[PDB]
């Protein structure tokens, strides 16, 4: 997706899941040509921080 | 440094919205790829998301 949406509850505990996104690359599966790394680039608002991503 | 430059908006408008105010970019944008943002009371300090920029 170009734009996902996820739901969570209020007052949930740290380390709570929001959602998992998926992606693909068009080179040979399980080579470095296709080996992937995920990161947050920003937030709305920018601060305070509320969410993280496993790389 | 040169001082910043006014812009004005009129209250309780029949729109439509997003209502445009002015465009602001770099001049040196042609040297390397950049993207645009704003912070402050009116987007991420309150009243939040009052103001908006095309990235």
UniProtKB/Swiss-Prot annotation, chain A:
It comes from the Eukaryota. It is found in: Cell membrane; Cell junction, Desmosome. Induction: Induced in the hours following cyclic mechanical strain in keratinocytes. Expressed at intercalated disks in the heart, where it is colocalized with CDH2 (at protein level). Expressed in intestinal mucosal cells (at protein level). Disulfide bonds: none annotated. Calcium may be bound by the cadherin-like repeats. A component of desmosome cell-cell junctions which are required for positive regulation of cellular adhesion. Promotes timely incorporation of DSG2 into desmosome intercellular junctions and promotes interaction of desmosome cell junctions with intermediate filament cytokeratin, via modulation of DSP phosphorylation. Plays an important role in desmosome-mediated maintenance of intestinal epithelial cell intercellular adhesion strength and barrier function. Expression is decreased in the intestinal mucosa of ulcerative colitis patients, potential adversely effecting wound healing of the intestinal mucosa. Interacts with DSP, PKP2 and JUP. Interacts with DSG3; the interaction may limit the interaction of DSC3 with p38MAPK family members and therefore repress p38MAPK signaling activation. It is linked to Arrhythmogenic right ventricular dysplasia, familial, 11: A congenital heart disease characterized by infiltration of adipose and fibrous tissue into the right ventricle and loss of myocardial cells, resulting in ventricular and supraventricular arrhythmias. This is Desmocollin-2. The chain holds residues 245 to 299 of 901 of the full protein.
Swiss-Prot record, chain B:
Glycans are attached at residue 31. It is found in: Cell membrane; Cell junction, Desmosome. Expressed at intercalated disks in the heart, where it is colocalized with CDH2 (at protein level). Expressed in intestinal mucosal cells (at protein level). Induction: Induced in the hours following cyclic mechanical strain in keratinocytes. Interacts with DSP, PKP2 and JUP. Interacts with DSG3; the interaction may limit the interaction of DSC3 with p38MAPK family members and therefore repress p38MAPK signaling activation. A component of desmosome cell-cell junctions which are required for positive regulation of cellular adhesion. Promotes timely incorporation of DSG2 into desmosome intercellular junctions and promotes interaction of desmosome cell junctions with intermediate filament cytokeratin, via modulation of DSP phosphorylation. Plays an important role in desmosome-mediated maintenance of intestinal epithelial cell intercellular adhesion strength and barrier function. It is linked to Arrhythmogenic right ventricular dysplasia, familial, 11: A congenital heart disease characterized by infiltration of adipose and fibrous tissue into the right ventricle and loss of myocardial cells, resulting in ventricular and supraventricular arrhythmias. Calcium may be bound by the cadherin-like repeats. This is Desmocollin-2. The gene is DSC2. The chain holds residues 136 to 190 of 901 of the full protein.
């Amino acid at each position: 997706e170009e734009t996902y949406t996820f739901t969570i509850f209020e007052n949930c505990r740290v380390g709570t899941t929001v959602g998992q996104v998926c992606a693909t690359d068009k080179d040979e599966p399980d080579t470095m040509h296709t080996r992937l790394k995920y990161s947050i680039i920003g937030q709305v608002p920018p601060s305070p921080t509320l969410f993280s991503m496993h790389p | 440094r040169w001082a910043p430059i006014p812009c004005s908006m009129l209250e309780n408008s029949l729109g439509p919205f997003p209502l445009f105010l002015q465009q602001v970019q770099s001049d040196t944008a042609q040297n390397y790829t950049i993207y645009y943002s704003i912070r402050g009371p009116g987007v991420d300090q309150e009243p939040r998301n009052l103001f908006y920029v095309e990235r």
